[PDB]
Ligand binder design. Structure first.
Ligand SMILES: CC(C)C[C@H](N)C(=O)O
Lengths: 463, 471
C-alpha cells in the first residue's frame, strides 16, 4: 500500500515544462513590453528574469534532495519553520490558491476550444462553464483510475504544446531570414530607463516563470530522487527560457508594437496574419496547453493534500489509498469538488489579485528556511550542497517580489493576509489541542462518515 | 477511535451486494451526468447567434488624417526641412494621426507649365535621401504619408491653367514615379477649376487601384451644393471628396442633423470624408467656445476626419498678428514665435496644455484614441434619432462591442437632454442607465453611471454616454 515510485525523469521533465508554459506566453506576453516601450530592452528583461528564476530552481533542487518529502513548500516550511506556519500555508492553498488556479485554467480552455466558431464576438457564458466542468470531471477520473494514465496524458499534451510553439518560432525565424529584418533595425530606441519602469518590467517577467517547482510536490514517488530530481529541474529550466525568448522574437518580428500592445490574444493575431489558412491551429494549440496545465495542477494539489492530512492538520481521512490501484482517491475527489464549486462564481478572473503577495511570501519563506537549516544543523547528510550564493540572490529577489505588491494595491494584499490568517481558529481549537479532549460527538460522526466513504471507495490508509 | 476499516476487514465488509451495486450505480450515474453536461453545452452553442463579418478595412478607414499647408510654417522655422519633421513625426503620433498629408513638396517656380516638374523635391525642403528616410521612420511608427500633387501651389490655380491638362499627364507619370518611391496615396485640390474632371478621376482611381489595393486618392473642392457633389460621386466610389458642405455658422441642432442625414441618404450610407474646408482651419468660421463641439462631432461621424495643422490646439490666426492667416505658425513653446513676445499665453501652446486635463489638446488625444481603438466607432452603424429643439444626437453600435452614444447641443441655452427615439433596432435597444466617458466643459466625473432619462444639458455640452451589449 506504499505509493508507487513510478515517477520517471521524462515524466518529471514533462511536469515541469508542461506546467510552466501555459497561456502566459500565448495570450499575454505584453507585460514586459508595455513598461519598456522598446523591443531590445524587452528581450533583455526576459533573459534577466529567466536567469533569476533558474537560480531559484537550483535552490529548490537542493531543498528537495535534502529533505525528500512531498509537499514542496509545506514539508520544508514545516521541518524548518514549524507546523502552525505550515498550517497557514496549507490553509491558504486549500482555500484560495489551488481551486482558483484550476478553475481559471479550465475556463480558459473552454474559452479557446470554441473560439473559431465565434471569432470576433464573445462566446456564450453557459457553454463556457459547462465545458469547464466537463473538463475537470474528465481529468479527475483519468487520475483516479491509475497513475500511468496521468503521466500518459501529461506526455501527450506537453508534446503537443511544444510542437506548436516550435511551429511559431520556426515560421517567425523563417520570416526574419527572408531578407526583411525589418522591425530589428533601430532597436532600443525610446526605451524607458527609469527605475520605476525596470522594476515593473522585472516583476512582470518574474510572474511569467511561476511554476518551476511542480515536480517537488511528488518527490516521494520519483524512482530515485537523488538523480532524477536535480537533473529534471536543470534540464527543464533552459528549455523554457529559450522557448520564451525565441517566441518573443517571433512576435516582435511579424507584428508591430501598435497592436501587440493592444491585441487581446497575441498568438491568434499572429496566426491570422501569417498562416493564410490554418488560422484555427493556434487556438486549438492553446486549448491543448491549457488541458495539460490543468492536469499537472491536479497532480500536485492532490499530493499536497495527501501529505497535509498525513501530518494531522487535515481530517484523518484524506490519507487513504486504493487497494488494487494505489491512487489517493479521496484527495483527488476533494480537489475536484473544490474546483467545481469555484466555477460557480461569476468573474473569478479578479481573485488572482488576492493572493499575489501570499504565494511569493511562502516561496521566500521556504528559501530562508533552507538558510536557517544550513546554519542550525549543518551535519545532516546532504547529497548535493550548493554555495550560499544562490539562496542569497533569490531571497533578495523574493524580498523584491513581496515588496512590489504591498506598496501598490495595498488593500488587496491586506485582504489576502486576512484570508490567509482566517484559519487560525481551527488550528488553536481543534488541531494543537491534543487527542481525547475534543467533544466525543464530532469524533464519533467523523469516524462514522470515514468508514462510510472508506467502504465506498476501497481505501485503507498507508501501511 | 474507529480508525476506519482495516485492509482485510475492509475486504470482508465489502462482500455485501448492496455496496457493490451502489458502486456500480454511482459510476453509471457519473458517466450519464457528464454526457448530459456535454450535450447541454453543445445544444446551447447551436442555439446561439452567429455574428457579423469584418468589413475588411483599409488603413485610412481608421482614425484621422492630418493636412499640412506649408512645411516651413509647421515646425515654426524658416527652413523647409524634412529633417525638421523628424522632430514632428513624434508630435503627429502624439496626436495619434492615422495618416498624413504633406504639402506640395515638388518644385514650383511660376505659371510655366513645363518647368514645374513633380519628380524632384525642392532643395529648401530637403533631398531624396532624407525624404526616403522620413518614409522609413514614418513606416516604423505606422504613419503612412500621402503626397500632395497639386501642381501650382504658388499661383491662383493649382493646374497653372483652368483649361489645359497636360499637367494631368504629369500627374499620371508622377504617380508611378512616387509609387516606386514609396508614397501611400495622392491628393489633388481645386477640382472645380479642372475641366473634364470625372474622366481624369476615373482614370487615376483605376491606375491607383492597379498599383495596389491600399493606394488612395483624395479630391478637394470648395463647392457647397449637394448636386455638384452627387454628380462628382457618380462613377467611382473610392474617391474621398472634401468640400465646404458642413460649414454652417448657424448650424442649428436641427440644421446640422438635416445636412448630415441628407448627405448620407443621398449615398446610401457609403464611406465619405468629414471636414469643413479644403485648406482652411476650423477657427476660420467658428468662435472659441465651439471648437470642442466640432472636435467631438467630426471624430464620431462615419468617415475619415480630415484636419488641418494647428487645429489640435485651437490655433487662431486672428488673435496672433503679423502672419498670413493661410500659413500660421505652430506655438510649440512661448518662444516658438520670436516676434512680439508676451503676445502668447500658456493656454495657447502645446506644453501648457499637455498637463492640463481640461485643455483642448487633451480632448484631441482622448478622442483620437477612442476612435482609433474601438470597433463601434471604426466601422459601426450610424443612427440619429429626433431630439429636443436644437439637439443633435446619434448612436454607434457594431455587433456586440461597447456601444457609443453622443449628445450634442448647437445652442447657447441650457436644455433638458431628453432622449426619446422609440425607433432603435432590437440589438440597439437603449437602456435606462449607462456610464460616461467625458464632456466638453467640466462639471461631472468619469466612470460614474448616469441614468438615461433625466439628463441636464448646459449650453455647448457634448457627452459620451456608453452602454454595453445586451439583448
Ligand atoms: C502558474 C502557471 C499555470 C502559469 C504559467 N507558468 C504561465 O507562464 O502562464
Amino acid at each position: 500500500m506504499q505509493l508507487k515510485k513510478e515517477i520517471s525523469l521524462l515524466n518529471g521533465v514533462s511536469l515541469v515544462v508542461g506546467n510552466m508554459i501555459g497561456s502566459g506566453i500565448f495570450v499575454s506576453p505584453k507585460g514586459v513590453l508595455v513598461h519598456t516601450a522598446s523591443y531590445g530592452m524587452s528581450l533583455i528583461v526576459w533573459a534577466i528574469g529567466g536567469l533569476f528564476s533558474v537560480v531559484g530552481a537550483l535552490c529548490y533542487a537542493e531543498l528537495g534532495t535534502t529533505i525528500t518529502k512531498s509537499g514542496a513548500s509545506y514539508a520544508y516550511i514545516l521541518e524548518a519553520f514549524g507546523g502552525f506556519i505550515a498550517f497557514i500555508r496549507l490553509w491558504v492553498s486549500l482555500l484560495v490558491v489551488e481551486p482558483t488556479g484550476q478553475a481559471i485554467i479550465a475556463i480558459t480552455f473552454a474559452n479557446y476550444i470554441i473560439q473559431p466558431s465565434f471569432p470576433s464576438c464573445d462566446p456564450p457564458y453557459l457553454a463556457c462553464r459547462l465545458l469547464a466542468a466537463a473538463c475537470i470531471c474528465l481529468l479527475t477520473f483519468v487520475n483516479c483510475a491509475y497513475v500511468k494514465w496521468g503521466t500518459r496524458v501529461q506526455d501527450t499534451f506537453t508534446y503537443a504544446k511544444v510542437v506548436a510553439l516550435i511551429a511559431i518560432i520556426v515560421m517567425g525565424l523563417v520570416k526574419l531570414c527572408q531578407g526583411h529584418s525589418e522591425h530589428f533595425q533601430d532597436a532600443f530606441e525610446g526605451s524607458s530607463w527609469d527605475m520605476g519602469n525596470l522594476s515593473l518590467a522585472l516583476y512582470s517577467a518574474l510572474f511569467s516563470y511561476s511554476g518551476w517547482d511542480t515536480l517537488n510536490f511528488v518527490t516521494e514517488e520519483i524512482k530515485n530522487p537523488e538523480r532524477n530530481l536535480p537533473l529534471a529541474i536543470g534540464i527543464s529550466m533552459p528549455i523554457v527560457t529559450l522557448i520564451y525568448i525565441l517566441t518573443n522574437v517571433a512576435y516582435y518580428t511579424v507584428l508591430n508594437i501598435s497592436d501587440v500592445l493592444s491585441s487581446d490574444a497575441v498568438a491568434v493575431t499572429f496566426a491570422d496574419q501569417t498562416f493564410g489558412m490554418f488560422s484555427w491551429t493556434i487556438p486549438i494549440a492553446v486549448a491543448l496547453s491549457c488541458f495539460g496545465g490543468l492536469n499537472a495542477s491536479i497532480f500536485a494539489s492532490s499530493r499536497l493534500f495527501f501529505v497535509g492530512s498525513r501530518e494531522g492538520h487535515l481530517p484523518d481521512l484524506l490519507s487513504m489509498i486504493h487497494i488494487e490501484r494505489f491512487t489517493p482517491i479521496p484527495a483527488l475527489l476533494f480537489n475536484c469538488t473544490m474546483a467545481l464549486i469555484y466555477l460557480i462564481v461569476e468573474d473569478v478572473f479578479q481573485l488572482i489579485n488576492y493572493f499575489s503577495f501570499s504565494y511569493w511570501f511562502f516561496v521566500g519563506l521556504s528559501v530562508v528556511g533552507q538558510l536557517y537549516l544550513r546554519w542550525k544543523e549543518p551535519k545532516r547528510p546532504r547529497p548535493l550542497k550548493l554555495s550560499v550564493f544562490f539562496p542569497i540572490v533569490f531571497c533578495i529577489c523574493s524580498v523584491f517580489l513581496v515588496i512590489v505588491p504591498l506598496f501598490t494595491d495595498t488593500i488587496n494584499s491586506l485582504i489576502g493576509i486576512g484570508i490567509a490568517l482566517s484559519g487560525v481558529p481551527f488550528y488553536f481549537m481543534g488541531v494543537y489541542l491534543p487527542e481525547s479532549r475534543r467533544p466525543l460527538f464530532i469524533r464519533n460522526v467523523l469516524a462514522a462518515i470515514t468508514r462510510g466513504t472508506q467502504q465506498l471507495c476501497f481505501c485503507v490508509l498507508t501501511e | 477511535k474507529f480508525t476506519g476499516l482495516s485492509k482485510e476487514e475492509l475486504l470482508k465488509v465489502a462482500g455485501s451486494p448492496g455496496w457493490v451495486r451502489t458502486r456500480w450505480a454511482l459510476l453509471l450515474l457519473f458517466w450519464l451526468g457528464w454526457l448530459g453536461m456535454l450535450a447541454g453545452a453543445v445544444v446551447i452553442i447551436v442555439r446561439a447567434p452567429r455574428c457579423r463579418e469584418l468589413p475588411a478595412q483599409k488603413w485610412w478607414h481608421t482614425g484621422a488624417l492630418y493636412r499640412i499647408g506649408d512645411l516651413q510654417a509647421f515646425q515654426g522655422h524658416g527652413a523647409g526641412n524634412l529633417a525638421g519633421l523628424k522632430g514632428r513625426l513624434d508630435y503627429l503620433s502624439s496626436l495619434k494621426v492615422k495618416g498624413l498629408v504633406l504639402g506640395p513638396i515638388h518644385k514650383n517656380q511660376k505659371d510655366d507649365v513645363a518647368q514645374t516638374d513633380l519628380l524632384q523635391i525642392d532643395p529648401n525642403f530637403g533631398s531624396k535621401e532624407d525624404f526616403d528616410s522620413l518614409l522609413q521612420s514614418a513606416k516604423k511608427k505606422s504613419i503612412r504619408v500621402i503626397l500632395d500633387l497639386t501642381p501650382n501651389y504658388r499661383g491662383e490655380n493649382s493646374w497653372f491653367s483652368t483649361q489645359v491638362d497636360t499637367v494631368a499627364t504629369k500627374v499620371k507619370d508622377a504617380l508611378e514615379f512616387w509609387l516606386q518611391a514609396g508614397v501611400d496615396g495622392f491628393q489633388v485640390r481645386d477640382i472645380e477649376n479642372l475641366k473634364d474632371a470625372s474622366s481624369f478621376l476615373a482614370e487615376w482611381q483605376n491606375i491607383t487601384k492597379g498599383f495596389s489595393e491600399d493606394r488612395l486618392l483624395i479630391a478637394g473642392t470648395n463647392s457647397s451644393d449637394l448636386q455638384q457633389i452627387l454628380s462628382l460621386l457618380e462613377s467611382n466610389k473610392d474617391l474621398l471628396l472634401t468640400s465646404s458642405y458642413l460649414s454652417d455658422s448657424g448650424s442649428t441642432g436641427e440644421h446640422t442633423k438635416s445636412l448630415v442625414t441628407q448627405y448620407l441618404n443621398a449615398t446610401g450610407n457609403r464611406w465619405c470624408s468629414w471636414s469643413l474646408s479644403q485648406a482652411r482651419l476650423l477657427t476660420s468660421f467658428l468662435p472659441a467656445q465651439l471648437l470642442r463641439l466640432y472636435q467631438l462631432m467630426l471624430f464620431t461621424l462615419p468617415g475619415t476626419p480630415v484636419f488641418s495643422y494647428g487645429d489640435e490646439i485651437g490655433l487662431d490666426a486672428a488673435a496672433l498678428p503679423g502672419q498670413p492667416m493661410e500659413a500660421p505658425v505652430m506655438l510649440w513653446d512661448e518662444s516658438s514665435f520670436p516676434d512680439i513676445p508676451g503676445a502668447v499665453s500658456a493656454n495657447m501652446t502645446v506644453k501648457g496644455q499637455s498637463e492640463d486635463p481640461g485643455s483642448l489638446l487633451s480632448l484631441f488625444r482622448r478622442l483620437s484614441d477612442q476612435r482609433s481603438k474601438e470597433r463601434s466607432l471604426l466601422h459601426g452603424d450610424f443612427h440619429a434619432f429626433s431630439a429636443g429643439p436644437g439637439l443633435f444626437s446619434y448612436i454607434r453600435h457594431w455587433d456586440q462591442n461597447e456601444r457609443f452614444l453622443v449628445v450634442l447641443n448647437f445652442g447657447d441655452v441650457g436644455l433638458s437632454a431628453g432622449l426619446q427615439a422609440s425607433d432603435l433596432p432590437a440589438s440597439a435597444s437603449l437602456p435606462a442607465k449607462a456610464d460616461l466617458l467625458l464632456s466638453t466643459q467640466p462639471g461631472r466625473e468619469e466612470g460614474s453611471p448616469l441614468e438615461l432619462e433625466r439628463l441636464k444639458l448646459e449650453p455647448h455640452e457634448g457627452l459620451l454616454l456608453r452602454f454595453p451589449y445586451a439583448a
